[PDB]
Amino acid sequence: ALTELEKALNSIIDVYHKYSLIKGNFHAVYRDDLKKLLETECPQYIRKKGADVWFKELDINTDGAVNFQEFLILVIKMGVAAHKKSHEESHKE
Amino acid sequence: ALTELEKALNSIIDVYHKYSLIKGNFHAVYRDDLKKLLETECPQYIRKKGADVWFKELDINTDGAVNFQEFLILVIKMGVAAHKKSHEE
Numbered sequence: 001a002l003t004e005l006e007k008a009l010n011s012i013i014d015v016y017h018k019y020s021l022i023k024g025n026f027h028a029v030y031r032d033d034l035k036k037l038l039e040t041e042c043p044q045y046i047r048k049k050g051a052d053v054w055f056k057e058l059d060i061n062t063d064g065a066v067n068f069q070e071f072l073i074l075v076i077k078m079g080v081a082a083h084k085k086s087h088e089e090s091h092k093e
Numbered sequence: 094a095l096t097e098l099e100k101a102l103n104s105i106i107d108v109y110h111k112y113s114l115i116k117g118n119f120h121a122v123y124r125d126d127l128k129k130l131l132e133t134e135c136p137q138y139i140r141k142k143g144a145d146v147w148f149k150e151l152d153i154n155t156d157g158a159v160n161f162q163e164f165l166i167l168v169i170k171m172g173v174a175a176h177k178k179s180h181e182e
């Protein structure tokens with residue numbers, strides 16, 4: 001049996017693999033792959049920046065693809081934004 | 094509606110609040126609280142480091158607790174490790 005934290009991380013892994021297995025290297029999310037990822041998995045405040053802008057920022061080692069480690073940058077920024085908004089809703093700030 | 098990615102993040106947030114709401118400042122996880130988190134939410138290869146060792150690593154500003162930002166360090170390291178180990182055995 002897995003813990004909720006373990007199942008959450010495996011879910012994030014499955015989301016990445018969903019788009020990394022589309023073509024080419026199995027641990028590479030290419031520009032067009034990331035576009036479909038943003039439109040399907042991400043909310044509007046993430047989408048508005050566009051796939052081209054996100055791809056350029058996420059491609060840390062500049063190899064023309066997004067690996068899982070680079071993908072976590074997007075995941076964490078979403079997590080922070082989600083937590084920040086929920087914190088601002090519980091408190092009438 | 095919520096995407097699979099959004100739900101996973103909410104679960105992670107819920108996991109942190111589960112231990113931060115125990116006592117004192119509700120936005121802070123203390124040493125005993127972290128030990129509880131590690132023993133309940135984390136796999137063996139993560140636990141083997143030690144609760145005291147993990148706490149010193151996570152409490153980077155040394156205010157005596159792990160806040161949400163510091164907690165994400167653990168989440169990131171666990172995520173990388175889980176992915177790496179999922180492609181083994």
Ligand SMILES: C[As](C)(=O)[O-]
Nearest residue numbers: 086087090110119
């Ligand atoms: C609802 As809260 C513990 O993020 O202030």
Ligand SMILES: [Ca+2]
Nearest residue numbers: 020023025028
């Ligand atoms: Ca690929």
Ligand SMILES: [Ca+2]
Nearest residue numbers: 059061063065
């Ligand atoms: Ca890259």
Ligand SMILES: [Ca+2]
Nearest residue numbers: 113116118121
């Ligand atoms: Ca607390």
Ligand SMILES: [Ca+2]
Nearest residue numbers: 152156158159
């Ligand atoms: Ca701290």
Ligand SMILES: [Cl-]
Nearest residue numbers: 049053054057
């Ligand atoms: Cl950005």
Ligand SMILES: [Cl-]
Nearest residue numbers: 090114119120
């Ligand atoms: Cl609170």
Ligand SMILES: [Cl-]
Nearest residue numbers: 113119120161
């Ligand atoms: Cl908090």
Ligand SMILES: [Cl-]
Nearest residue numbers: 026027180181
């Ligand atoms: Cl592999």
Ligand SMILES: [Zn+2]
Nearest residue numbers: 083087110161
């Ligand atoms: Zn919080």
Ligand SMILES: [Zn+2]
Nearest residue numbers: 090091119120
């Ligand atoms: Zn609060």
Ligand SMILES: [Zn+2]
Nearest residue numbers: 087088091093
């Ligand atoms: Zn506040």
Ligand SMILES: [Zn+2]
Nearest residue numbers: 017027176180
């Ligand atoms: Zn993988």
